[model samples]
Target: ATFGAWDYGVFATMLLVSTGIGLWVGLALAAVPVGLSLAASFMSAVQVLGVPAEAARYGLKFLWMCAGQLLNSLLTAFLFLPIFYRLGLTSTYQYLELRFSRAVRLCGTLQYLVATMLYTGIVIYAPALILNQVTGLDIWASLLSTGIICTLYTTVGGWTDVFQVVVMLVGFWVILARGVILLGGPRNVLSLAQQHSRINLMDFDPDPRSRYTFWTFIVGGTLVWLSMYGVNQAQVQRYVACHTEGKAKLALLVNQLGLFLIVASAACCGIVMFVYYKDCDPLLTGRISAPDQYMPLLVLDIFEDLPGVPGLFLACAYSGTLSTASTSINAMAAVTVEDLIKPRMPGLAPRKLVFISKGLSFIYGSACLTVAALSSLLGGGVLQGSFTVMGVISGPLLGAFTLGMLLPACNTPGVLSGLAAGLAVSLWVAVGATLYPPGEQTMGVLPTSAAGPALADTFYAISYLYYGALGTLTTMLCGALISYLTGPTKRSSLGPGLLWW
Candidate 1:
């Protein structure tokens, strides 16, 4: 049963194709990215649990994270989406080729590919953790099995070609249903939250060092969102895959709403959990193994009498990770075939190309699984892990895109050099922060059992919130300097509709 062949058939129907998705359908498929992004994963649910736990342990200041989501949506819609919509990009990295050189495009694509692989691994670990908590499965065994399950389905499944949309919707429905049940009633949930002070949202702290300040949530978060939603191929693919620019923009709008609603729901669930466990404090009491296990524990606590409820929660968790993983695998395949392969072999036979594409999908799945297996070696909770890895990759990629779109004079040499420099700086900060955290902001949970250094203050510490901004600024400055030194490209030579101005 563990290695069942039938499991592959489950997601086989979730294919995406090249026929072009309609606006409404585009809107629905657009939900795949947003849904997979915030709703489908165990990490997301875990975040809800962690939110209340954090507030119970510390204060309600962390609620500002939602504000960051709202700001991200606005920036992506008004600022970033227009650039991709206007250009009609299939692979967002393709824009790099158009604006700069083939080398730049490949560089950007490679960064995206690496980042998504790291993300998929980390995302899968969340569900594996859930399995470990609920069923007492070995963490590595769960990760390996889940990773293989996701890999097999993704490799066998083709892109969604209309037949797949219904299954996608069904999967999303189950997650929401299970989530609602776990959270209990909204009125009850809110009353509990308010009583416990978990509803506190405002954090006007002037300290830059504060973890979740209003300024960081709004300004710094916008930068992170811009890179994640604005320029990342995962989101951009959904936008361009739509029939028209208007429809694509519409889908983007719908995605924004979906992201907010889903995240808000997660936040609500966090509050409810806080109220339920206000007195006990599970982590400190040694009730759960780690902070990430809080959601699984909460589900079990609420639904232990119900036989299928636990299974439903498990299914929901698996589905979320699978959705994101499968989409990423498919997207990476598209980029590999289109951006990397087809250009070198334009005359390659269609049949041969299709065969190779499938092969590439399998290869990507294996790589992701390998990363997932090794993810336990990395530090931080699922949410922080996702954000930090994203920052490391997206920051530099976003920097390169920003240079191409806004600075016509920045040539390929300048942009590429700037990207290298930006990536180096981002990694230094990310690694440094990870190794030497600036003051322990305890979630008051059972210390994360996944082995890592204890958190402490560091003079060089920079918040993850500012990663995107820092990387972008570094790239822009470095690229500008090199561009001026190497002599600027003529504005007339730049492609139309590519430049922001």
Candidate 2:
């Protein structure tokens, strides 16, 4: 069936609603002191539709992983982040060039570039996935349409500062209310999920291989959050661009208070989805092709005749995607401009540089689209794949930053050496785990009629969540070892504000 009139109407409505939110918030930022605006914008939303789907597929177990994030924000704010502000860096990669050799700086830039572009690719794929659901068109065509519009928006200097995560008071909880109203009540959903064994939160298993165990998710997951908020260019821009370290840290802490509620609601929706389909299992029945689709499917089926709510859900999902993808595209241009281009073209004017930045964004956006098209070959839950891609790429990038700040003795060779170790460990296991994903018993603990294939006995079995921490920790240790062997650098030569000490 074609997308109805109501669908188009509600889609545009959300666009207007969200755009107004940005416009007002944008003006409100300028209206008051700039500090407040900067703080609000810095608190970017990290969750996407994947969380909802993962919760639906994987259950409330992700909360264990999520519980570690406050620690992440605090660490980033007080310890990891303040250095960027102290150094006054325009690009996070710039810190490397100052702390280490030019060669190390170049490597950092490339690592960040690889991670950002790859991440953008995965993000762009999501909208196309939604398109494939709404329309029966070829997935490639769907990808092209989504990619082109996204790229074009950036090409024309679109609504820039990709902040403003409007909860729409009605977006989540209202839907949950509607859902609870549909299925007998709160008791039915909670009781049904418990009966189905979906709420697997108390697995305090020390085994690193268990996917959602407390240790794996908390220890491993915090590293994933650290790599994201601690060292990524997008994050550095926010925390560093702020008025002061204290307020930025304040924003960091405050943001999570709101984030927890959003995440908890999404988790609740997971069990709600389980209850919605208590009589009919979608994935096992082949009603949905992937784990992530369950949440979207849940939205439409619940309000089959209703239109506005369904549109709001898609709008929110698309909003999450476009904002993240666009900002990364923006940061891609920023990183390339500051770290790569400016070094070569020192005489370039700001106006000229700005134009070039837009061009790079357009180019990078296109490349991101290209990667999304290539994302066709990737399989497994989108959330799972997102982390693997991040860990294999960005996780190593974080190691270099961690190395320079914490271990001032780490030499240029150490940076390169550590990067090598990090990637090898990350990709070796990440790729294998991706290929041989341990299926069923972990995600589908909720009884189903189908059986499936699985993963390696040891290294490959390590939770994919552990990949980032593993990559980063390996990089740091190997880096320190090699640097010490190469003879520790003289502290006299190193500049101030470079070391964490």
Candidate 3:
């Protein structure tokens, strides 16, 4: 698959063969185990498929985890892509420009640039950083090594190359991880989890505030997905870039189906990790020292007996990691060129603009490499650190964009003011959350073994999923009220009618 698609004919043939074999051999029994097997496969997907995968420690809870991914996908296709496609808001920043002003557009492009860099940095650094702990490789060296590869392929090939790499790499990683798990005999793995008291699948009556629960998966997940897929530039790109609306719709439908399975696989990976390492978490042992280091530790344990398994697993991680970086870098470039550069550079030819976009890919790639190198210096636990970094920035932007898209009459002044206010609120919450956390630690990133200190009774835990929703709602409320006070944009000054589609 990395060799690039041979043809649709080949894909159809392979799909048929797999489907036929699955139906014939498994029959009805396959439904129970196959669902579980798919859940297990997601271990890789949860960690690797997204921008910055931090929520890996929490393993599979079947319906709960997958529900997040599916819910998000549904929101994206239903609410987000349709408007962008119908209104022709192709580039992320272009929408800002159309809905607001050049100033607003520039602000968004800059914010996106910052956010994407931060995100790409995390996505690139995390796995390589983990690999470093496992292999005793220097973290910066690993970051550079991976970043260079992604930059090379993406700069040369653009989005098509990036997407191809993702599908191929995700497939390969799954096969390697799944093959190793199955070889160990999944039944024995389940037995181990059952024995160790680490397997916790059902939390049906959990509080809604709990991040990983059926309620949150249904309610909070919906809101999170609405912000992520619906308003997200990365998601919308896939839809708009398709050959036609019909194709885009088809691609979106397929993406949804794939997501349902991908998320399930990620949850399974969590369960598998819990079972494998429950007795003596490798991180707790001196063998591996970081929370993020737990993954490579499990990979080593799973593949220790199997020769070449480590290499394959490492390749799989790199494949998933690099593909994300490539796609993001390309997306950043597209947004920059179309929304920021081209309109200003009127005299520039199309080829010249393309050159500029590709060039930014390298520049931004290097910038992301720098951020990855810097991440180790930030001192929180991996999940907290990663999510916090994303939350402070992405959360506010999610609100701004959501408000812009959801409310057709939201004017520039209203949106800008609302975004500012929302960001202020987000920052205040983040600062307070950090200063007075549920737990106490001088520094953030701690190994699982280091309990450090616990916080005062005042300390409260906040779910990361709600950050985007919180920011967006705050912004929209503020923006809408302010916009109504400021008066609507004149009918003539308003955007095209289809803009709200």
Please give, for residues 378-462, the per-residue lDDT of candidate 3 as tens digits. 5434444445455555556666667676676678888788878777776666666656554323211222332212322232344
Candidate scoring better on lDDT of 2 and 3:
2
> Model 3, stretches more than 4 Å misplaced?
1-59, 154-211, 218-220, 349-355, 380-391, 434-437, 440-460, 488-501
How well is each residue in 1-501 modelled by candidate 2, as lDDT tens digits? Answer: 334678768877776675565446435612122323322332221244566666666678877755867667777877676788877377677778788878888987888788878777878887777766665557788788778666644654252332334442236676688889888778878888888777788878777776776777777777877887788776667676666777777667655555565567777876787778776678888978876667668777877777777776776666556655776787788888878888899987989998999888888999989888877556635666667777877788788888888776888898889999999999988878766666566433456544332347566777888898889888898988999998897777777645455
Per-model TM values vs. the true structure: 0.81, 0.89, 0.75
The deviation in Å at residue 484 for candidate 1 is 2.4
Model 3: per-residue Cα lDDT at residue 120:
75
Q: Candidate 2 regions off by >4 Å?
A: 1-3, 12-47, 159-164, 348-352, 442-444, 449-455, 498-500
Displacement of residue 52 (Cα, Å) in model 1 is 6.3
Which candidate number has the best lDDT? Answer: 2
Whole-structure CA lDDT of model 1: 0.63
Q: Give the TM-score of candidate 3.
A: 0.75
Who wins the TM-score comparison?
A: 2
**What ordering of candidates by TM-score runs from best to worst?**
2, 1, 3
RMSD of each: 6.7, 3.8, 9.6
